[PDB]
């Protein structure tokens, strides 16, 4: 699969991004899974005023509420797309929550988590619960 390629990071390798059923995305690079909300989601919410991120070291199960993204008109929980452990959060978002509006699917990522084996993600891709973002 293309997930193997992204995990291996051999020459000419490229990270793969997938979108979920709930306007979230995840990207795989090595064993690091980066998670954010989609461009669609940031547009639904309007200008973001606060981002509440998970604590580093948090053990997540698929579906756990992990973050909150908040505009004046609306708030939205962001759920873990896979089981794993939070290892990094996007420190830019404290001063610049609007980076999520500007670059939702790239620089406005919310957190990074480790997954040791991609069997769960492989299942969700095979089911087309999650789909490749092109």
Curated annotation (Swiss-Prot):
<dbReference type="GO" id="GO:0005960">
    <property type="term" value="C:glycine cleavage complex"/>
</dbReference>
<protein>
    <recommendedName>
        <fullName>Glycine cleavage system H protein</fullName>
    </recommendedName>
</protein>
<feature type="domain" description="Lipoyl-binding">
    <location>
        <begin position="32"/>
        <end position="114"/>
    </location>
</feature>
<dbReference type="Pfam" id="PF01597">
    <property type="entry name" value="GCV_H"/>
</dbReference>
<dbReference type="GO" id="GO:0019464">
    <property type="term" value="P:glycine decarboxylation via glycine cleavage system"/>
</dbReference>
<feature type="modified residue" description="N6-lipoyllysine">
    <location>
        <position position="73"/>
    </location>
</feature>
<keyword id="KW-0450">Lipoyl</keyword>
<dbReference type="GO" id="GO:0005829">
    <property type="term" value="C:cytosol"/>
</dbReference>
<comment type="subunit">
    <text>The glycine cleavage system is composed of four proteins: P, T, L and H.</text>
</comment>
<comment type="similarity">
    <text>Belongs to the GcvH family.</text>
</comment>
<dbReference type="InterPro" id="IPR000089">
    <property type="entry name" value="Biotin_lipoyl"/>
</dbReference>
<dbReference type="InterPro" id="IPR033753">
    <property type="entry name" value="GCV_H/Fam206"/>
</dbReference>
<dbReference type="InterPro" id="IPR002930">
    <property type="entry name" value="GCV_H"/>
</dbReference>
<dbReference type="InterPro" id="IPR011053">
    <property type="entry name" value="Single_hybrid_motif"/>
</dbReference>
<dbReference type="InterPro" id="IPR003016">
    <property type="entry name" value="2-oxoA_DH_lipoyl-BS"/>
</dbReference>
<dbReference type="InterPro" id="IPR017453">
    <property type="entry name" value="GCV_H_sub"/>
</dbReference>
<comment type="function">
    <text>The glycine cleavage system catalyzes the degradation of glycine. The H protein shuttles the methylamine group of glycine from the P protein to the T protein.</text>
</comment>
């Amino acid at each position: 699969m293309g997930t193997l390629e992204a995990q291996t990071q051999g020459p000419g390798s490229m990270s793969k991004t997938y979108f979920t059923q709930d306007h979230e995305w995840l990207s795989v690079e090595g064993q690091v899974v980066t998670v954010g909300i989609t461009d669609y989601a940031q547009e639904q919410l309007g200008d973001l005023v606060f981002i509440d991120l998970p604590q580093n070291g948090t053990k997540l199960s698929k579906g756990d509420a992990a973050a909150v993204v908040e505009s004046v008109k609306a708030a939205s929980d962001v759920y873990a797309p896979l089981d794993g452990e939070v290892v990094e959060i996007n420190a830019a978002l404290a001063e610049s929550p609007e980076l999520v509006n500007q670059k939702a699917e790239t620089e406005g990522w919310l957190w990074k988590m480790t997954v040791q084996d991609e069997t769960q993600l492989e299942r969700l891709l095979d089911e087309a619960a999650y789909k490749e973002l092109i």
